Amino acid sequence: PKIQRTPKIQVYSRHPAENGKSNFLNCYVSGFHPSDIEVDLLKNGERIEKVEHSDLSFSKDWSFYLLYYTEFTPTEKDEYACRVNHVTLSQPKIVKWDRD
Amino acid sequence: FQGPTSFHVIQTSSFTNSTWAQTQGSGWLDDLQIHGWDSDSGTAIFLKPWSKGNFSDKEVAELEEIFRVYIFGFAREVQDFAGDFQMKYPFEIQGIAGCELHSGGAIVSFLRGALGGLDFLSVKNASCVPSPEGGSRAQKFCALIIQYQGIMETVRILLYETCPRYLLGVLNAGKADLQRQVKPEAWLSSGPSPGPGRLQLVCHVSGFYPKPVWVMWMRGEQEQQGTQLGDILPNANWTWYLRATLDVADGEAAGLSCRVKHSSLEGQDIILYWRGSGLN
Ligand SMILES: *[C@@H]1O[C@H](CO[C@@H]2O[C@@H](C)[C@@H](O)[C@@H](O)[C@@H]2O)[C@@H](O[C@@H]2O[C@H](CO)[C@@H](O[C@@H]3O[C@H](CO[C@H]4O[C@H](CO)[C@@H](O)[C@H](O)[C@@H]4O)[C@@H](O)[C@H](O[C@H]4O[C@H](CO)[C@@H](O)[C@H](O)[C@@H]4O)[C@@H]3O)[C@H](O)[C@H]2NC(C)=O)[C@H](O[C@@H]2O[C@@H](C)[C@@H](O)[C@@H](O)[C@@H]2O)[C@H]1NC(C)=O
Ligand SMILES: CC/C=C\C/C=C\CCCCCCCC/C=C\C/C=C\C/C=C\CCCCCCC(=O)O[C@H](COC(=O)CCCCCCCCCCC)COP(=O)(O)OCC[N+](C)(C)C
Ligand SMILES: *[C@@H]1O[C@H](CO[C@@H]2O[C@@H](C)[C@@H](O)[C@@H](O)[C@@H]2O)[C@@H](O[C@@H]2O[C@H](CO)[C@@H](O[C@@H]3O[C@H](CO)[C@@H](O)[C@H](O)[C@@H]3O)[C@H](O)[C@H]2NC(C)=O)[C@H](O[C@@H]2O[C@@H](C)[C@@H](O)[C@@H](O)[C@@H]2O)[C@H]1NC(C)=O
Ligand SMILES: CCCC/C=C/CCCCCCCCCC(=O)O
Ligand code: NA
């Protein structure tokens, strides 16, 4: 009941990215402890407003995990990311979506 | 039969200080959520139309009451004994309890508790069992909880009598969703690898239900044993995403393919072929 666990952040699209075609952007945040956490999805560095997330759950090793997601249409130049803050993080950690 | 085989409830109780604690909870079939717990009301949220299984509204309400009373009493009791148990705030307690249907039809029940993200106790043969990670604090806790009238008998009934009939009733009630077959989509990509003259090929598989899946890099009929599977990750609305990767020398990537087998494909495996010189 002493050591904290930093969250693992994985960012992936539901379908293979095709510019101009509607898609879903997922952020799976896992492996962390304690459960207190803040997660945003970003478009071009700005907080996406319409984002859904799962109720809290945890894995067999008691580590918490959450799924955040939003509809998005990928384009050539737009950048998307998952921003996470947790007690183990000095500042929010930003993980960019990389289709390849 | 396919789809989930277990039901369980989970609890996360976060103790900020001597006066403030909050609890989150939910109910699950494997990793598919079917109940939420609404702390606004002290009642359950039924996430699917079949989420009550074959239980009557009265029995469902009785169980909501048990959980409501438990959630409230648990925090109070833990705060009352945090002094005697040498607890330092903040701390977080987790619990999981439920039952699972095995091959051959037996249903096995379980209850596990954690403190600080480490195992603390379990229930076995309807007794409180301290886990070694819980130390003497866990032993004190089990010795305490048996002194509370009715708790262990209620836990025994819930685990060994109520949960098995609920599991069977809800697996049947939800079968249209729980045993549905959803075909995955698959695509290939590639990327660098730190090896001289080596690259990493990636086979992506997404949107498949149920969760069991088989993905392998192939050369003709030869399964490439160097295939590495990633984490199986969730999509929203009960499907998953999995990548299979293969580290290969530059001039040896030609001839590779990715083969996907899944219960939904009714024998027609997906085969993707890796083509060279940026031919997608
Ligand atoms: C919700 O569903 C549960 C599962 O129902 C079955 O599966 C679903 C998917 C549907 O297909 C249903 O149509 C189907 O019933 C219900 O639980 C089950 O209830 C039945 C009774 O209806 C019960 O069968 C009895 O079993 C005992 C033997 O049980 C012991 O031994 C077995 C191994 O052999 C062991 O597994 C058990 O744990 C026990 O140790 C048997 O003696 C009974 O025989 C008597 O009755 C039958 C007629 O039913 C008669 O032919 C005989 O001659 C004799 O008189 C009978 O076969 C199942 O064991 C039970 N399953 C489980 C896992 O508990 C559930 O029903 C409710 O709970 C039951 C425990 C029982 O109290 C019922 O009366 C209740 O209505 C149902 N509803 C709720 C609210 O949970
Ligand atoms: C966690 C749940 C969260 C969310 C659930 C989410 C969704 C649920 C949806 C419900 C609908 C679906 C139904 C499916 C459920 C079927 C099976 C459940 C499976 C497993 C459950 C097994 C154990 C659960 C663990 C809970 C143990 C509680 C036992 C107990 O009895 O406790 C309180 C009394 O609260 C106390 O004071 C407790 C204080 C002591 C604390 C220590 C206890 C630690 C237990 C560890 C065991 C070693 C009960 O109250 P009752 O008297 O029974 O009735 C109240 C008195 N009435 C009548 C006057 C009001
Ligand atoms: C134990 O923690 C409680 C919760 O504190 C809050 O939550 C935690 C998770 C953390 O984020 C903290 O940073 C938060 O403060 C304490 O209760 C809170 O106490 C503060 C004051 O210290 C109070 O803030 C006020 O809120 C009112 C409007 O509600 C506002 O007008 C004020 O300007 C001020 O912001 C919170 O409302 C209160 N939260 C509750 C009660 O849920 C608690 O403090 C104890 O309770 C309060 C009511 C006061 O009597 C305090 O003097 C008292 O100590 C903490 N208890 C201890 C023993 O540390
Ligand atoms: C959904 C039901 C799962 C059952 C959960 C049990 C929780 C075990 C943690 C036991 C408490 C750990 C510290 C004790 C503090 C105290 O009492 O002083
Ligand atoms: Na979750």
Swiss-Prot record, chain A:
The keyword Secreted applies. The modification Pyrrolidone carboxylic acid is found at residue 4. GO terms for cellular component: cytosol; early endosome lumen; early endosome membrane; endoplasmic reticulum; endoplasmic reticulum lumen; ER to Golgi transport vesicle membrane; external side of plasma membrane; extracellular exosome. GO terms for molecular function: identical protein binding; MHC class II protein complex binding; peptide antigen binding; protein homodimerization activity; structural molecule activity. Changing residue 61 to P: Increases tendency towards amyloid formation. Disulfide bonds join 27-82. One of its GO terms (biological process) is antigen processing and presentation of exogenous protein antigen via MHC class Ib, TAP-dependent. It comes from the Eukaryota. Residues 7-95 form the Ig-like C1-type domain. Keywords: Amyloid, Amyloidosis, Disease variant, Disulfide bond, Glycation, Glycoprotein, Immunity, Immunoglobulin domain, MHC I, Pyrrolidone carboxylic acid, Secreted, Signal. It is found in: Secreted; Cell surface. Glycans are attached at residues 3, 21, 43, 50, 60, 93, 96. Glycation of Ile-3 is observed in long-term hemodialysis patients. Component of the class I major histocompatibility complex (MHC). Involved in the presentation of peptide antigens to the immune system. Exogenously applied M.tuberculosis EsxA or EsxA-EsxB (or EsxA expressed in host) binds B2M and decreases its export to the cell surface (total protein levels do not change), probably leading to defects in class I antigen presentation. Belongs to the beta-2-microglobulin family. It is linked to Immunodeficiency 43: A disorder characterized by marked reduction in serum concentrations of immunoglobulins and albumin, and hypoproteinemia due to hypercatabolism. Patients may suffer from recurrent respiratory tract infections and severe skin disease. Heterodimer of an alpha chain and a beta chain. Beta-2-microglobulin is the beta-chain of major histocompatibility complex class I molecules. Polymers of beta 2-microglobulin can be found in tissues from patients on long-term hemodialysis. B2M alone (not in complex with HLA-I) interacts with M.tuberculosis EsxA (ESAT-6) and an EsxA-EsxB (CFP-10) complex; the tripartite complex can be detected in the host endoplasmic reticulum. The B2M-EsxA complex can be detected in patients with pleural tuberculosis and is stable from pH 4.0 to 8.0 and in the presence of 2M NaCl. This is Beta-2-microglobulin. It comes from Homo sapiens (Human). The chain holds residues 21 to 118 of 119 of the full protein.
UniProtKB/Swiss-Prot annotation, chain B:
It is a single-pass type I membrane protein. It is found in: Cell membrane; Endosome membrane; Lysosome membrane. Glycans are attached at residues 17, 54, 125, 237. Its main location: membrane. GO terms for molecular function: endogenous lipid antigen binding; exogenous lipid antigen binding; lipopeptide binding. Disulfide bonds join 99-163, 128-142, 203-258. Keywords: Adaptive immunity, Cell membrane, Disulfide bond, Endosome, Glycoprotein, Immunity, Immunoglobulin domain, Lysosome, Membrane, Signal, Transmembrane, Transmembrane helix. Residues 164-274 form the Ig-like domain. Expressed on cortical thymocytes, on certain T-cell leukemias, and in various other tissues. It comes from the Eukaryota. GO terms for cellular component: cell surface; cytosol; endosome membrane; external side of plasma membrane; extracellular space; Golgi apparatus; intracellular membrane-bounded organelle; lysosomal membrane. GO terms for biological process: adaptive immune response; antigen processing and presentation, endogenous lipid antigen via MHC class Ib; antigen processing and presentation, exogenous lipid antigen via MHC class Ib; immune response; positive regulation of T cell mediated cytotoxicity. Residues 1-275 are extracellular. Coiled coil: none annotated. Heterodimer with B2M (beta-2-microglobulin). Interacts with saposin C. During protein synthesis and maturation, CD1 family members bind endogenous lipids that are replaced by lipid or glycolipid antigens when the proteins are internalized and pass through endosomes or lysosomes, before trafficking back to the cell surface. Interaction with saposin C is required for the loading of bacterial lipid antigens onto CD1B in the lysosome. Antigen-presenting protein that binds self and non-self lipid and glycolipid antigens and presents them to T-cell receptors on natural killer T-cells. This is T-cell surface glycoprotein CD1b. It comes from Homo sapiens (Human). The chain holds residues 22 to 296 of 333 of the full protein.
